[PDB]
Amino acid sequence: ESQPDPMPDDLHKSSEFTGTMGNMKYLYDDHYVSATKVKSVDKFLAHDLIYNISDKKLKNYDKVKTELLNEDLAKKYKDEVVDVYGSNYYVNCYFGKTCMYGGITKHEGNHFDNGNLQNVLVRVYENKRNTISFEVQTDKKSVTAQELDIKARNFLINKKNLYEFNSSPYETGYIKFIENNGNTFWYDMMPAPGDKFDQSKYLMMYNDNKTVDSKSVKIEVHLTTKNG
């Protein structure tokens, strides 16, 4: 069965977060590792994989380490030709090196024809009303929930100021994936309470490498505002 939906005390509140909200913004605002048709070159811990991947733009890294939930997942992908998409960090990253979690899909067999892109509808609720809906895209048949989440958050940062440097216009926020077998799961879009944001611990949720069928999955973002 599904992860049950958030109960009230399940969700992080931005007002109980007194660190820097730019640290969350930074992770999703035009920020991702993406590499295409790659094979792992190395390992640090038993559950991760290192890839030779350069950032086209700001030439910040040329090796990426992705950590996975378990050793079996690292074994499974070790020698496969894969596509990689995820959110990267430098704070507490050790192995121009950069770190992430999950983000791996096999290359072969995993694309639509004719260079087709698949649109995935994201419906945004604010205080339980459907205010906007937009579409994110992927060329991948089986896509990581991480990658879809990243795309949807990037759009929301720009359109709805989901995150700013100081804090957020929003108190709570979660993203919900509905699979066509009935399976649902969700991620808290807000930082853990306190004065520091731990990026590595935040992104750690993506280490399950959870993938969804792009063509049938639904996405709901549910946000609440500050007062009422």
83 is in an annotated binding site: yes
Q: Would you say 83 or 147 has its CB closer to Zn ion?
A: 83
Sheet harboring 97-101: ordered strands across? 48-52, 63-67, 97-101
Taking only Cα atoms into account, the Rg of the chain, rounded to an integer number of angstroms, comes to 17
Q: Would you say 138 or 167 has its CB closer to Zn ion?
A: 138
Nearest distance from C-beta of residue 65 to Zn ion, angstroms = 20
Beta strands in 127-227 (DSSP E): 129-138, 142-144, 170-178, 184-188, 211-213, 218-225
Reduce the DSSP state of residue 159 to 3 states and report it. helix
Q: Would you say 83 or 220 has its CB closer to Zn ion?
A: 83
Reduce the DSSP state of residue 225 to 3 states and report it. strand
Chain positions contacting Zn ion, by CB under 5 A: 83, 107
CA distance 213 to 114: 19
CB-based contact 52:63 (threshold 8 Å): yes
222 is in an annotated binding site: no
Nearest distance from C-beta of residue 148 to Zn ion, angstroms = 16
CA distance 2 to 180: 12
Residue nearest to Zn ion (CB): 107
Residues with Cβ within 8 Å of 153's Cβ and at least 6 positions away in sequence, in order, are 28, 162, 175, 189
* Alpha-carbon distances of 9 from 13, 89, 110, rounded to whole Å: 9, 28, 39
Structure tokens at 102: 């999950």
9 is in an annotated binding site: yes
Nearest distance from C-beta of residue 85 to Zn ion, angstroms = 10
Which residues participate in the annotated binding site? 9, 83, 107, 111
Which residues participate in the annotated binding site for Zn(2+)? 9, 83, 107, 111
